[PDB]
Design an enzyme around this catalytic site. Structure first.
Site, mmCIF file in Angstrom:
data_model
loop_
_atom_site.group_PDB
_atom_site.id
_atom_site.type_symbol
_atom_site.label_atom_id
_atom_site.label_comp_id
_atom_site.label_asym_id
_atom_site.label_seq_id
_atom_site.Cartn_x
_atom_site.Cartn_y
_atom_site.Cartn_z
ATOM 1 N N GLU A 114 0.811 -1.223 0.000
ATOM 2 C CA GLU A 114 0.000 0.000 0.000
ATOM 3 C C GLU A 114 0.846 1.276 0.000
ATOM 4 O O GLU A 114 0.694 2.160 0.847
ATOM 5 C CB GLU A 114 -0.984 -0.007 1.167
ATOM 6 N N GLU A 160 -5.833 -8.111 -0.971
ATOM 7 C CA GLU A 160 -6.554 -7.863 0.287
ATOM 8 C C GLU A 160 -8.012 -7.509 -0.008
ATOM 9 O O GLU A 160 -8.302 -6.708 -0.915
ATOM 10 C CB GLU A 160 -5.934 -6.707 1.092
#
Length: 478
Positions: free
Chosen positions: A177, A376
């Protein structure tokens, strides 16, 4: 009679080392940024301490003790029939301080052991190299990724991993991320993405862009060395995909959303195309942001583009042009976002928008034309154990199912190239934003609470056999 997804679709589950391993000082592992972050809850930030203090609670020190129970946990992943398992290699297990000449053999052996166990059951490891857990020593000694020297430390770490696991791990990503720090207004992202500790008077935005730059260069360098070691390695980026919708069709809202996605996703442009969008350079000029950016960085970025885009998806945002004194359409993640009236949200205020996953898949495909990997997706919620000793998490099943339906439409109707899907926190683990056990994601319940009490016993939830059936039917039955 084939299914809508490919037979080799990579169904699995995802975690990160610091969130589940525990054994925080085992095998000579060094202190990581996660090891100095106290527990919080919804509404109260985790405290980032200047080290491991006596009066503070650090939930990542012990987490769920996967370091010791991994053989039993992996057995559970196999029972559900995972095709892959995503985790991170704890930087601090390989390089406790980060600047050592030689790697830590105990650390390398642990992942040999973990990866071997996965492979025993035909579960392909998927490895993130940096996942919110860089050596705290790098923070104090060099100032984290605000220092160019840290690029080399990362690439050394990456090379060591690529060499050690070149025949065991097919799928890699560099920085988890990486774009979270687009929100530089709060401390979490800059600390976890980049090891940035801000002091008073700091130009928080300028510092973030410098660290992001170094990380993008480090990523590109890591891609090049990984491929040089083994050209068959699939090495991707990892971006947190929160689609940003305009609130209305007012042209000003439209431009706000376009410019916000530009700022939040330029990282992907660099990872994929190998150069910065001009709007970033213009923005820096406007804000008098100075970035140490060399001709050699330019070459590295161009030559180190990724094979695929891994991304997390939990929610979508909405933006509008309400904020005054914003003549240049700047994006402030903490001020410009508004609620979407068309969706519900989790108890942590995370908007539930399965259709946004279809938008995201299309957006990435239309922009970048690379294969995608949903690494995710999850619904963090309070669980209660029923009289029968099982959590009947129908809400979690409903959330995951809704997203799976949309991702299958993206493949089947829209033609996106999708490698796989790994729900986040597949075994209950310590949450990132808040450091909570109560915010549960797993198909597997773990008995540990927010005061550190519990047996750590693992118990399948209702969602456990649900997902087992999803995988067995390749998503035909949800």
């Amino acid at each position: 009679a084939m299914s809508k997804l490919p037979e080799n679709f990579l169904w699995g589950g995802a975690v990160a080392a610091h969130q589940l391993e525990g054994g925080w000082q085992e095998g000579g592992k060094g202190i990581s940024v996660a090891d100095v972050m106290t527990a919080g809850r919804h509404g109260v930030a985790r405290e980032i301490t200047a080290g491991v203090l006596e009066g503070k609670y650090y939930p990542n020190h012990e987490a769920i003790d996967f370091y010791h129970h991994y053989k039993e946990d992996v057995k559970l992943f196999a029972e559900m029939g995972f095709k892959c398992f995503r985790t991170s290699i704890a930087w601090t297990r390989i390089f406790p301080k980060g600047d050592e000449a030689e790697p830590n053999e105990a650390g390398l052996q642990f992942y040999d052991d973990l990866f071997d166990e996965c492979l025993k059951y035909g579960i392909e490891p998927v490895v993130t190299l940096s996942h919110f857990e860089l050596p705290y020593h790098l923070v104090t000694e060099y100032g984290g990724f605000t220092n160019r020297k840290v690029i080399d430390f990362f690439v050394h770490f990456a090379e060591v991993c690529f060499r050690r696991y070149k025949d065991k791990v097919k799928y890699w990503m560099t920085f988890n991320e990486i774009n979270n720090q687009a929100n530089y207004q709060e401390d979490f992202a800059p600390f976890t993405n980049s090891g940035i500790v801000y002091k008073e008077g700091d130009d928080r935005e300028a510092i973030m862009y410098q660290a992001a730059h170094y990380e993008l260069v480090a990523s590109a360098r890591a891609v090049k060395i990984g491929h040089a070691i083994n050209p068959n390695l699939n090495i991707g980026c990892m971006v947190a995909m929160c689609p940003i919708y305009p609130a209305t069709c007012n042209p000003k809202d439209i431009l706000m959303a376009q410019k916000a996605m530009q700022k939040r996703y330029y990282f992907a442009d660099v990872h994929v195309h190998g150069f910065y969008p001009e709007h970033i350079f213009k923005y820096w000029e406007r804000k008098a942001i100075k970035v140490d950016f060399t001709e050699r960085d330019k070459k590295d970025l161009f030559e180190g583009t990724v094979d695929y885009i891994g991304f997390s998806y939990y929610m979508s945002f909405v933006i509008d042009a309400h904020r005054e004194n914003n003549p240049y359409y700047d994006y402030l993640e903490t001020e410009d976002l508004v609620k979407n009236p068309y969706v519900k949200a989790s108890d942590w205020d995370w908007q539930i928008d399965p259709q946004g996953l279809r938008y995201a898949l299309n957006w990435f495909t239309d922009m970048y034309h690379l294969p995608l990997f949903i690494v995710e997706n999850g619904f963090g919620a309070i669980d209660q154990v029923e009289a029968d000793g099982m959590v009947h998490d129908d809400y979690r099943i409903d959330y995951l199912g809704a997203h799976i339906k949309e991702m299958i439409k993206a493949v089947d109707e829209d033609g996106v190239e999708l490698m796989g899907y790994t729900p986040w926190g597949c075994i209950d683990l310590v949450s990132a934003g808040t450091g909570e056990m109560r915010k549960r994601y797993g198909f597997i319940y773990v008995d540990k609470d927010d005061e550190g009490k519990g047996t750590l016993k693992r118990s399948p939830k209702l969602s456990f056999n649900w997902y087992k059936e999803v995988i067995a039917s390749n998503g035909d039955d949800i």
